[PDB]
Amino acid sequence: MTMYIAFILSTIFVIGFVGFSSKPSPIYGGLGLIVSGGVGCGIVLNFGGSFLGLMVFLIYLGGMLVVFGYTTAMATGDWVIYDTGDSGFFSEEAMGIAALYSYGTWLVIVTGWSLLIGVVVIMEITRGN
Amino acid sequence: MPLVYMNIIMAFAIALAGLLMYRSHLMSSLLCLEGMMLSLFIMSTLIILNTHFTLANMMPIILLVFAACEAALGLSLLVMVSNTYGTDYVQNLNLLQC
Amino acid sequence: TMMSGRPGRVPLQFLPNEARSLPPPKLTDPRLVYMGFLGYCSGLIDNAIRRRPVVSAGLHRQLLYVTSFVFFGYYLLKRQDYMYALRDHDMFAYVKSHPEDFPEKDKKTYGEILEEFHPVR
Amino acid sequence: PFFDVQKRLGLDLDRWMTIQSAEQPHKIPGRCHAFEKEWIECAHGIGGIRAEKECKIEFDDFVECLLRQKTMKRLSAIKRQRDKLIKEGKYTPPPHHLGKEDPRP
Amino acid sequence: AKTLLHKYSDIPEGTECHRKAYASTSIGGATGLIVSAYSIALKPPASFLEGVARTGRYTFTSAAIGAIFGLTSCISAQVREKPDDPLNYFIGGCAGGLTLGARTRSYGIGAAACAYMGLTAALVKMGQLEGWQVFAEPKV
Amino acid sequence: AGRIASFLKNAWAKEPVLVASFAIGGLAIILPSLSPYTNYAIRINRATPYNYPVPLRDDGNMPDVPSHPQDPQGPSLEWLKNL
Amino acid sequence: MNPIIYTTLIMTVMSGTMLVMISSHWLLIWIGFEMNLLAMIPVLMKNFNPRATEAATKYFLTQATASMMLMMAIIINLLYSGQWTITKMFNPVAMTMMTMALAMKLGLSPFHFWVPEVTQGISLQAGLLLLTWQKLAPLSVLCQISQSINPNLMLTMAMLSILIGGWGGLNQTQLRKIMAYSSIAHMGWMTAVLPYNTTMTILNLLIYITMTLAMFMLLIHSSATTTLSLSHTWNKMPVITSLMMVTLLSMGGLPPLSGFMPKWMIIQEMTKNESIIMPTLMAMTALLNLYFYMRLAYSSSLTMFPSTNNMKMKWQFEHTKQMKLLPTMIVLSTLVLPMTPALSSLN
Amino acid sequence: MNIMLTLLTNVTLASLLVLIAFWLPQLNAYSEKRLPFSMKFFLVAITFLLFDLEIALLLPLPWASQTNNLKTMLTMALFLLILLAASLAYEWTQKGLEW
Amino acid sequence: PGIVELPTLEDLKVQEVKVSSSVLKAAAHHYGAQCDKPNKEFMLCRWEEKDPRRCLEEGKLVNQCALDFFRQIKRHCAEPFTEYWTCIDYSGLQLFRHCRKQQAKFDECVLDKLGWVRPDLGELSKVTKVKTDRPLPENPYHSRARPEPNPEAEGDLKPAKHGSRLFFWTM
Numbered sequence A: 001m002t003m004y005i006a007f008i009l010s011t012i013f014v015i016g017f018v019g020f021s022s023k024p025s026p027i028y029g030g031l032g033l034i035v036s037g038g039v040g041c042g043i044v045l046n047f048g049g050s051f052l053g054l055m056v057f058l059i060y061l062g063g064m065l066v067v068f069g070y071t072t073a074m075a076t077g078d079w080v081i082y083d084t085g086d087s088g089f090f091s092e093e094a095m096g097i098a099a100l101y102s103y104g105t106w107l108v109i110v111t112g113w114s115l116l117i118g119v120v121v122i123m124e125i126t127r128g129n
Numbered sequence B: 001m002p003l004v005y006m007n008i009i010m011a012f013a014i015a016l017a018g019l020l021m022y023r024s025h026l027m028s029s030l031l032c033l034e035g036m037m038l039s040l041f042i043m044s045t046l047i048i049l050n051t052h053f054t055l056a057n058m059m060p061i062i063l064l065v066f067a068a069c070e071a072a073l074g075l076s077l078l079v080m081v082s083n084t085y086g087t088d089y090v091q092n093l094n095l096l097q098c
Numbered sequence C: 001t002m003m004s005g006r007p008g009r010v011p012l013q014f015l016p017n018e019a020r021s022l023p024p025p026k027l028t029d030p031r032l033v034y035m036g037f038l039g040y041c042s043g044l045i046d047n048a049i050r051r052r053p054v055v056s057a058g059l060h061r062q063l064l065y066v067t068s069f070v071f072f073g074y075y076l077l078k079r080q081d082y083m084y085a086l087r088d089h090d091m092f093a094y095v096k097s098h099p100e101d102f103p104e105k106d107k108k109t110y111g112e113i114l115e116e117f118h119p120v121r
Numbered sequence D: 001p002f003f004d005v006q007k008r009l010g011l012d013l014d015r016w017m018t019i020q021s022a023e024q025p026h027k028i029p030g031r032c033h034a035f036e037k038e039w040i041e042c043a044h045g046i047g048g049i050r051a052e053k054e055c056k057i058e059f060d061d062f063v064e065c066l067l068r069q070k071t072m073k074r075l076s077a078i079k080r081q082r083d084k085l086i087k088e089g090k091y092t093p094p095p096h097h098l099g100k101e102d103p104r105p
Numbered sequence E: 001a002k003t004l005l006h007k008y009s010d011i012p013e014g015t016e017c018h019r020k021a022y023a024s025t026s027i028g029g030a031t032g033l034i035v036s037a038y039s040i041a042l043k044p045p046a047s048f049l050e051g052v053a054r055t056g057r058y059t060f061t062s063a064a065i066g067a068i069f070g071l072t073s074c075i076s077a078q079v080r081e082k083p084d085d086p087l088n089y090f091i092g093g094c095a096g097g098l099t100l101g102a103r104t105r106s107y108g109i110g111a112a113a114c115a116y117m118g119l120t121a122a123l124v125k126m127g128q129l130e131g132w133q134v135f136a137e138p139k140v
Numbered sequence F: 001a002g003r004i005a006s007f008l009k010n011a012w013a014k015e016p017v018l019v020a021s022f023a024i025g026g027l028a029i030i031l032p033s034l035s036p037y038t039n040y041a042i043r044i045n046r047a048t049p050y051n052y053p054v055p056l057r058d059d060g061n062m063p064d065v066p067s068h069p070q071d072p073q074g075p076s077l078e079w080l081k082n083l
Numbered sequence G: 001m002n003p004i005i006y007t008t009l010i011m012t013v014m015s016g017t018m019l020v021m022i023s024s025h026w027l028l029i030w031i032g033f034e035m036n037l038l039a040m041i042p043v044l045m046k047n048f049n050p051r052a053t054e055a056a057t058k059y060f061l062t063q064a065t066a067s068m069m070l071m072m073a074i075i076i077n078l079l080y081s082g083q084w085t086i087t088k089m090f091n092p093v094a095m096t097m098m099t100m101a102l103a104m105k106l107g108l109s110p111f112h113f114w115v116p117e118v119t120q121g122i123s124l125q126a127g128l129l130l131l132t133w134q135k136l137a138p139l140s141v142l143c144q145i146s147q148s149i150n151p152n153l154m155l156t157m158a159m160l161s162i163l164i165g166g167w168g169g170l171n172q173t174q175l176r177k178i179m180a181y182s183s184i185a186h187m188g189w190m191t192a193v194l195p196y197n198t199t200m201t202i203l204n205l206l207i208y209i210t211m212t213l214a215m216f217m218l219l220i221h222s223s224a225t226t227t228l229s230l231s232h233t234w235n236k237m238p239v240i241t242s243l244m245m246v247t248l249l250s251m252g253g254l255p256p257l258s259g260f261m262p263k264w265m266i267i268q269e270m271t272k273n274e275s276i277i278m279p280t281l282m283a284m285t286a287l288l289n290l291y292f293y294m295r296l297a298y299s300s301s302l303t304m305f306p307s308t309n310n311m312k313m314k315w316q317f318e319h320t321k322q323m324k325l326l327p328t329m330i331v332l333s334t335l336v337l338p339m340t341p342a343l344s345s346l347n
Numbered sequence H: 001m002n003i004m005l006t007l008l009t010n011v012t013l014a015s016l017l018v019l020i021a022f023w024l025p026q027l028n029a030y031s032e033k034r035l036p037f038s039m040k041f042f043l044v045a046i047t048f049l050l051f052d053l054e055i056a057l058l059l060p061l062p063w064a065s066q067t068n069n070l071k072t073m074l075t076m077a078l079f080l081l082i083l084l085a086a087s088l089a090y091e092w093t094q095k096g097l098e099w
Numbered sequence I: 001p002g003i004v005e006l007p008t009l010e011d012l013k014v015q016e017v018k019v020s021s022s023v024l025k026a027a028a029h030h031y032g033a034q035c036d037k038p039n040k041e042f043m044l045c046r047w048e049e050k051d052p053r054r055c056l057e058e059g060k061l062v063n064q065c066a067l068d069f070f071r072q073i074k075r076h077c078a079e080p081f082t083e084y085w086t087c088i089d090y091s092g093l094q095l096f097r098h099c100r101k102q103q104a105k106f107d108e109c110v111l112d113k114l115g116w117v118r119p120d121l122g123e124l125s126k127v128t129k130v131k132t133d134r135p136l137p138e139n140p141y142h143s144r145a146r147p148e149p150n151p152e153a154e155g156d157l158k159p160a161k162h163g164s165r166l167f168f169w170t171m
Ligand SMILES: CCCCCCCCCCCCCCCCC[C@@H](O)O[C@H](CO[C@H](O)CCCCCCCCCCCCCCC)COP(=O)(O)OCC[N+](C)(C)C
Pocket: A102, A103, A105, A106, A109, A113, D011, D012, D013, D023, H069, H072, H075, H079
């Protein structure tokens, strides 16, 4: 067994969190945050949630931590909890996530309104005066 | 309760302690908040996928979205602070006091 | 008491249908008169704040204050009476349904009861 | 506090996601569908206190299905004793557990 | 946690003076550590050395107060041969206040601490006797 | 009528991208409610077997439920084949 | 800001609170909290200035930390029992963490430090909204899970809140900080009766909201922020000072004024559960609130402080904008004791 | 396992090539002799972040098309895209896209 | 709490079907059309009993029926079937679309020899009825007895006795 690969990844996650938790030179703390996020995406992908792991790796790292780095630069045991059967001829995670449009109408409505209000709030705050 | 969940909660606690320590550089505080959020995302994803709670697969994505929005908001505030002081040291926010 | 989880409760009804089985408060109820007095006091305070003749600035405004206060007071009194009737009904039903926990007291007379006497000196 | 608008209007805004066993897409079952169903049917229309006191067996089974702490404990005990015996040398694994078995479809 | 309180309460009042003193010293040390941590967090004096000096003096003061209170109360309970008497706790509280005053070195704090600590200790003993509840469970 | 036509003519000049975007968006919003093939799409989605069809227990009062796949009873996918 | 944008942000704040109150899912409650926090920030920053920005960033940091703690508690509760419905917590650690999260959101001590500074930095209108409206969602959530909360933690936090509010109110001179400490003390009073009877919590919340709305509207009417600016008021609008003194006496718990109704009733409830020491302690502590209210009343109305010459010009102009519901708020916060039994309406 | 091997091979090859390129010229000895903080950049970064969030919401559309609730799914998708367009329009009209 | 019961290894012994997945996919339609009755009986039993240990006999029956089907195919149409499953096996996705020609040859051969008609589109996915003599399980979840509900008393409301009875209030 691969020396508890899930445990190895979890320990590396904790090590990265400790590294960036000391808050040294916020750019270096950011770099530690990218390392920890990559390790977490690895954990999620290894578990079986491919879409959610790729979702983290795209949204979090590519957009949000990139905006963080942009703003900073502008300034100065396992394997036993698993299943037994099969998923059929589809991926359960993808079906559950795609059920957002047919089932979660309320969630879509509230999230869209929150995002629009977030746009308005950002404009109002950064307007200045 | 396996060791993976224990390690994830340990990471969340470490990030919370880092947020509450407050050496300087409010950007580090925002980074600690987002580390806590990432730990929350990982833990929720593992819990939901483990139990095959299909309809709950929506929960992480939604979470992430909202949290990222908050991050954006926070950044805006940080910018204004710098634009008033020239730098983002935490100790500069001492005009208001108990 | 926590009658929130009481079975068969409509989630957002101010006055359930069964509340119609109780006598409505009289229009000359002292509490309704007190709500009217509160409305009149609000009218006088409104006149005072706006710097107007306190007693006789706006008669229509004072009348509207009194009428609104009386209306809300009447409905609030109806709801209060219904809730108290519900509490008493539940109390009596429970005390009837559990005779073991509320035994009949063995009635006694003061003649055969010894109470200690403490003289005052 | 809790203004139950949904039950008043019968809207079902957010009640479909509350539990594992409520109309999953493509009828994909939860990992603990049976235990959750049993506990829910045990504790329905009974009240919080009575449900906690009386349906404890079903909730214990549900938590065991969710976390499998007791199964982990049992498997760990078996593995530790097997390791001790194989260290002393009084036990030898069968071919099935050595990869020399005959697999079946 | 509540383990120290259980250690203090398990001992009979009229026996084992040293064990009672040790338990009271432990409770006082814990309280002193907590208050020192709060003072350090809210008012960082100048550096690490001043902080450790302040936490040490606070913990020592609290531990001394607790030890004196426990020892005096137990000794009075044994000598008077009358347990479950709040007077022993009153004497213990006044002795603890006297040591607080000696540590602070001013007679006013000593007298005020004696009075307001003997009163509190007597009230605690009365509550223990009569089963008074501070954090009452929700009966009705 | 004249003012609306004049405004559309003005917008088609010096701003064609916005006019095209709004026209395409409006068409995409409006058209599906009128197309007769949307029900066909719903039926095609409904006809895709993702799960195993669990047979029912016979009690002698199920004439509409076929006893064999070849039997004429039951839904037919000839309409899909003709598409 | 634009009036339409301000109205939209206010609607969004109210919609977030409504979503928190009317929802039966933990995720939707967290979403409502996030929407409330997101839309509440520009309301603090309507009048742009460094003080407002610093107050807004303090508020944002505190609320974001509280929301993250709340989400972690929800995650743990889901882990130990696969339930999303807001009911018995089914876990001690999750309940403790959620209690701390809701304490941070409410402002109970020792998480109270942000309230005085945020109230001081931001304007009177912003402060009024923050002080009364914000309390409704966390209090509703706490009322929904009152059967699971640990009495020790809630009771000790309420006692600490009352002590801290009473002690801190004595020193302050600015009116906004006095209001912040008053809010802290009132919430310490109100959350102490959660384990026993939530109806008393709701009644105290309503009475406190009425009193603080009346007092903030009076402070806005006579544009005074410091104590001396309030002392100058008697020379122009003595009626405002008299009404403010009556409302201050009501807020101190003096009978037969309305402010005596909650405390009394609350005490009664804790006496039904054989809790005697604590109500006595909270009463003797509320005496401190009474003291600094009385000092404010002495400064404002019962004595005539020296005036200024330029005040003569203010005698000729009238208050152009009149705020509706101020007389109703004063009457409801002063003369509603005789209708105490109406609390059986499960308000 | 295969993807881990591929990533490790890519990183190892890139690192080896970089270090040999950095050290090959190092064997031979030689002479060996602020304030501005433009707000528009931050605004475009924040706008990108928010639009990225909305794209994250929109992503599961390819699998959302097979639900038998085609009307509801279509309405929700068009609602999300309309809100995205409305956010862009609000940013446009209030001079949020100016340099 | 309790001891689990598991069938002995002699109860799980059966003649396995030793053909690969591509071979099974090549004759999947005819296998579904011909061997439908034992398969449907087994699957109904599996869904009703909710227990693998109560459906061993139906598993042995379906194995035997599949073996009989493949023995018939081997006896009559060995070579066209061999070509068809070879073609199906070559492709990575094992697509029916690749070699409709070999499928047509196999279908016509098996219609000539055994008179088998390939099921059309939308036929193997039908829901069917099964006539079985196995008794319907009365309590497959092994549930306990539901606790008694609350009294939920009823009556006619009467005005509260002496009003609110709150301190000095007489109404
Ligand atoms: C009712 C009160 C109206 C006035 C008050 C409005 C208060 C705020 C507005 C938000 C409330 C709108 C209610 C929508 C609740 C969603 C659920 C309901 O609508 O039913 C859905 C019906 O879907 C409808 O299409 C919803 C469309 C509504 C969204 C379009 C406009 C929303 C605007 C709301 C405000 C957002 C910002 C402002 C935008 C202009 C479910 O469809 P259905 O197929 O049966 O069930 C699928 C689940 N299955 C698989 C188990 C069967």
